[PDB]
Amino acid sequence: MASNEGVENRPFPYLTVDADLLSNLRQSAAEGLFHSFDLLVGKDAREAGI
Amino acid sequence: MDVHIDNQVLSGLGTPLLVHLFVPDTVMAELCPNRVPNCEGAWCQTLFSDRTGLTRVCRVFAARGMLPGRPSHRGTFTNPFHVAALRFYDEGGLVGELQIYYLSLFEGAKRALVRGIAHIFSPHALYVVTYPELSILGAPEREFRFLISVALRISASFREKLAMQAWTAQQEIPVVIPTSYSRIYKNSDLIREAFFTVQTRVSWESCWVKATISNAPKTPDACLWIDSHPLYEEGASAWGKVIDVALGTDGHCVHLATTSDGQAFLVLPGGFVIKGQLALTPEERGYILARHG
Amino acid sequence: MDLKVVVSLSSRLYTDEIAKMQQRIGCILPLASTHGTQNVQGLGLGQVYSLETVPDYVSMYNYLSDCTLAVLDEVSVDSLILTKIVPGQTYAIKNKYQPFFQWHGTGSLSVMPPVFGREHATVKLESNDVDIVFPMVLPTPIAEEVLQKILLFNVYSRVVMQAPGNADMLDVHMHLGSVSYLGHHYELALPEVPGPLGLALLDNLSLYFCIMVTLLPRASMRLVRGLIRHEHHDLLNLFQEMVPDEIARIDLDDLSVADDLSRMRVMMTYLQSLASLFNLGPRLATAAYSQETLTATCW
Amino acid sequence: MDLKVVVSLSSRLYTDEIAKMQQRIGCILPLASTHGTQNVQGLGLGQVYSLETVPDYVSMYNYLSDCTLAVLDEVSVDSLILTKIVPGQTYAIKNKYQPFFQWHGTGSLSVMPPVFGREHATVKLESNDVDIVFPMVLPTPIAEEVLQKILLFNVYSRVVMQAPGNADMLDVHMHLGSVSYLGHHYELALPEVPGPLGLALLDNLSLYFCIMVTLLPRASMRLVRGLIRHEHHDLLNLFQEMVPDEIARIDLDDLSVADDLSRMRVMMTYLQSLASLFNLGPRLATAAYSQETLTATCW
Amino acid sequence: GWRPPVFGDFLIHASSFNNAEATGTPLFQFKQSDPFSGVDAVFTPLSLFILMNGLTRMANLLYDSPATLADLVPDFGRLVADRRFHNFITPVGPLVENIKSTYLNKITTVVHGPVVSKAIPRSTVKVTVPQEAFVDLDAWLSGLQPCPADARLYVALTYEEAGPRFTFFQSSRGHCQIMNILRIYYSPSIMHRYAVVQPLHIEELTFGAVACLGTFSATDGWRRSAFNYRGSSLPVVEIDSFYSNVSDWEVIL
């Protein structure tokens, strides 16, 4: 689908989850398995302005 | 004057001989109604009778000129017995065909080098420049008689269709009659005048002529080409109107509508419509294809 | 060293407009003057391209060359926040355009008026009664292709005039009309009349073409005349065993080193000039590209 | 800021290779990757210009225009230490190319691929089984004239292979062998043979120039006749007399109607791809040159 | 704020360069054939008006006799025949330092970068050219045209029937149309050159060559200073904040 639909980049205080989610994340991102996904590159991988 | 050497370096090296002609605005008053636009796109062509037929189409640019030292030539600058024709347009709705003839030119080219000549088709005086580098009666008539023959056939075809329909009428266009007169069923007065004017109207730019010349199958099948000349000769008649009706509503209009397939419709005031058929031999298609396209 | 301009909107725009304008974030648009605070009319390209007027593309190239270009950074309900282009600084860039061409690494980019589609690149602001008109940025080869197409159309729409329809059905709409790309074909908007501006460019082209035709060497014409009949090639596939008789009429004199050396020398001096008569657009060198992000690093 | 990057070699270099690199320290290289550290095959121009396959010149041009240029700074037993070139920074050059070519102050450096022999231009690395090929740098009018003379030589050699009688090779050699710039006399040997097969560096520029030069007058007469109006620039009319008469005599009706669009379009593509070539690719200026130290302060 | 400009050093013989010249005039360099380590043979535009033939009175008051200059460019009459003299006039930039010596003379200019002096922490300077033989090509053809960021000074050198003459042009629009507007400007002088074109062969057809000197800070304009030499009364346009970026000679016709 489109990149940013429900993606809110506000700096929520996220929870730390022990499980691993990166198993075949690139290919699943390529096909479109889960909708409303954004890729954030490293230079824009920061806490947003409030 | 620059147009002559422009032609001699670009078109005079494509066409052998040229005669350089200057037209006064009074001669221009013949073609164009109520307008004085500059004459760049004007297409001169030749047309020669009784041997064979051909046209060669070229622009010589025209500009108004003060350069004659003689005050009288103030104005625009652009086998004898035959025709030349200038087709003049602008961005707006104005198309004119002017006819220059010979034996004004070969006599006129005799010595600002200038000489006055006369028009035969539309009589006025024209002026011919000569640069230092430099069977009668049937000949004009043909473009008349040819087209008028078509009119006769078209008129006869109307009669045949009336002979189909027991010689009365039928109304094909929703136009309310102006009133329910008792003194209206002498409309024999109207239809006679159709055969008055249709036979006395002949011009190269008739509606059916443009109907003969079709660029596409589909869009001319979807399009109608109309002309309305007024009854009995009051004023200037209009030809070549496009329909991309109100004509039946208003009086003084014997409307004539032609499709590209040659089908015609004579519309009277009151919305009465008579269908007419066209007959064109391949000679006639060759002529109209030559001049018009 | 600080590039930042805020544009103050006169009256607040609706949510429907703010949604699509925030969708348009990160795209190039031209600005009129170098001031901190700008009026909204100079911000849009629509001043040079009104709806009512005849479309004139080369004059829009003239307009877009003068107007210092900016990148939309933040869309707010009363404010359009832009950074600008110093020629010697590096800044990120994003591509999200409807006639869509995927960009290549180390392929230079050019800026053009929106030839392709009137509604597709532009958004009107009826709350403030203007239109913001996004320009078209393309990779350079297809940009030069579209430029050649528009110039040849400005010629041939004059040439056809009226009389042959067989010219009209193919010439006006086949090469000049469609821009092909890999697995794609996109239309062009064609002016109903070929209007002004392009014709002065054609004048300068005609000046250079006459001066170049004065100085032509013969030995290259000999190479062509020999190879088109004696052999066959893919470059020569335009030319069958038939030769234009033009080259036979120019081909009567012998060959000589001293004349062709000087002829080639002057043609070298004149082909340097054609790069500036051809280019007409700002160049952006691409140093990095992100296909997943549609966000390149131009220069 | 700190932009010096190192390529790491797979195997140990031999001593002959070490001294050969010490001969050619301060010279320019093509750098395939923007990030410096990656395998040795990138820094070579051998992928485009190889001993194995016959190279067409425009491939090397398109490759050099895209890829960045780098200057060697240090050679060590397992490492090559390079400096990237970015505009806005000053650097040092030594002219360790082989064919000595005098560098004046405030001259225009141009980077063009070598037309000389391969053994003269490159170094082979037997240790890592690769080839590094150095792009030539020569002054701008001299490089113009080099292209002139090799192109005219290709035309004359192909004609004399077509027809032996028309072209005298001694008249070719006496003129094209000598290159004079500012009282300095350099004798440059031409390509050795054209052959029946595709020849060493040229025959692609030559055929492009040839199709261009044959299409030029046929296109030009059509354009000049198409252009005529009121608002056209007046000098065009003054140059209408300037054309030779037989070029003016050509009728447009002979070449067919859509073929006008074909010949014009092909001619325009060849013009636009051809013109930027003669600006001679990447360019730089040098502030001061030292002859006895052989050191150029460039930027 | 930018990187300090790349200076160039030059040793000219003092008889072909006046000490009196103001700090900031642009200088042009000529290439000698066999020796060029000794005398650089740099020209100033006022010297170029003498080597090409009330500016004339000042150009004769500063420079007296010309045959030294005629010795420096011996083939000037052969170069104007072939249109090769523009291939030798290279642009160098405005003047900064003039260290005085009897036989030699030490000229230090600015090849590239923002114009400045070097002794103190970089005191700036300005670049001056006289208002005659100077044509603003923005007031020449004059909705509202947009106000650009930056303005360019071009140089043209034109071989008219009375020999070659140089001109400096100040515009701000673009490089791709300054060529066309410069053809529109030199249209009538071109109309006066093709009297005796037809006997002369192909090499003469070139009318002039255009380079782009640099980009000065626009949206300001210029001023009108003068020369303070003894008899001078010579008006001179001066411009600040200049950034030199000499270009190649692009041909016009």
From Swiss-Prot, chain A:
Compartment list: Virion; Host nucleus
Protein family membership: Belongs to the herpesviridae major capsid protein family.
Chain's role: Self-assembles to form an icosahedral capsid with a T=16 symmetry, about 200 nm in diameter, and consisting of 150 hexons and 12 pentons (total of 162 capsomers). Hexons form the edges and faces of the capsid and are each composed of six MCP molecules. In contrast, one penton is found at each of the 12 vertices. Eleven of the pentons are MCP pentamers, while the last vertex is occupied by the portal complex.
Subunit (UniProt): Homomultimer. Makes the hexons and eleven out of twelve pentons. Interacts with triplex proteins 1/TRX1 and 2/TRX2; adjacent capsomers are linked together in groups of three by triplexes, heterotrimeric complexes composed of one molecule of TRX1 and two molecules of TRX2. Interacts with scaffold protein; this interaction allows efficient MCP transport to the host nucleus. Interacts with capsid vertex component 2/CVC2. Interacts with the small capsomere-interacting protein/SCP.
Name under which the protein is recorded: Major capsid protein
Underlying gene: MCP
Span covered, complete protein: 1 to 50 of 1381
Curated annotation (Swiss-Prot), chain B:
The organism's place on the tree of life at top rank: Viruses
GO BP annotations listed: chromosome organization
Compartments where found: Virion; Host nucleus
UniProt keywords, alphabetically: Capsid protein, Host nucleus, Late protein, Viral genome packaging, Viral release from host cell, Virion
InterPro entries: UL17-like
GO cellular component, one term: viral capsid
HAMAP family in UniProt: HSV_CVC1
Task of the protein: Capsid vertex-specific component that plays a role during viral DNA encapsidation, assuring correct genome cleavage and presumably stabilizing capsids that contain full-length viral genomes.
Family: Belongs to the herpesviridae CVC1 protein family.
Assembly description: Interacts (via C-terminus) with capsid vertex component 2/CVC2.
Protein name (database record): Capsid vertex component 1
The species this protein was found in: Epstein-Barr virus (strain B95-8) (HHV-4)
Gene encoding the protein: CVC1
Curated annotation (Swiss-Prot), chains C, D:
MF terms in GO: structural molecule activity
Annotated localization: Virion; Host nucleus
Keywords tagged on the record: Capsid protein, Host nucleus, Virion
Superkingdom to which the source organism belongs: Viruses
GO cellular component assignments: host cell nucleus; viral capsid
InterPro entries per record: Herpes_capsid_2
Quaternary data: Interacts with TRX1 and major capisd protein/MCP.
Record's function text: Structural component of the T=16 icosahedral capsid. The capsid is composed of pentamers and hexamers of major capsid protein/MCP, which are linked together by heterotrimers called triplexes. These triplexes are formed by a single molecule of triplex protein 1/TRX1 and two copies of triplex protein 2/TRX2. Additionally, TRX1 is required for efficient transport of TRX2 to the nucleus, which is the site of capsid assembly.
Family named by the database record: Belongs to the herpesviridae TRX2 protein family.
Protein name per its UniProtKB record: Triplex capsid protein 2
Organism: Epstein-Barr virus (strain B95-8)
UniProtKB/Swiss-Prot annotation, chain E:
Protein name, UniProt field: Triplex capsid protein 1
Keywords assigned: Capsid protein, Host nucleus, Virion
Protein function: Structural component of the T=16 icosahedral capsid. The capsid is composed of pentamers and hexamers of major capsid protein/MCP, which are linked together by heterotrimers called triplexes. These triplexes are formed by a single molecule of triplex protein 1/TRX1 and two copies of triplex protein 2/TRX2. Additionally, TRX1 is required for efficient transport of TRX2 to the nucleus, which is the site of capsid assembly.
Region of the whole protein represented: 84 to 364 of 364
Entry keyword ATP-binding: no
Similarity remark: Belongs to the herpesviridae TRX1 protein family.
GO cellular component assignments: host cell nucleus; viral capsid
Location of this chain's protein in the cell: Virion; Host nucleus
Lineage, highest ranks first: Viruses, Duplodnaviria, Heunggongvirae, Peploviricota, Herviviricetes
MF-aspect GO terms: DNA binding
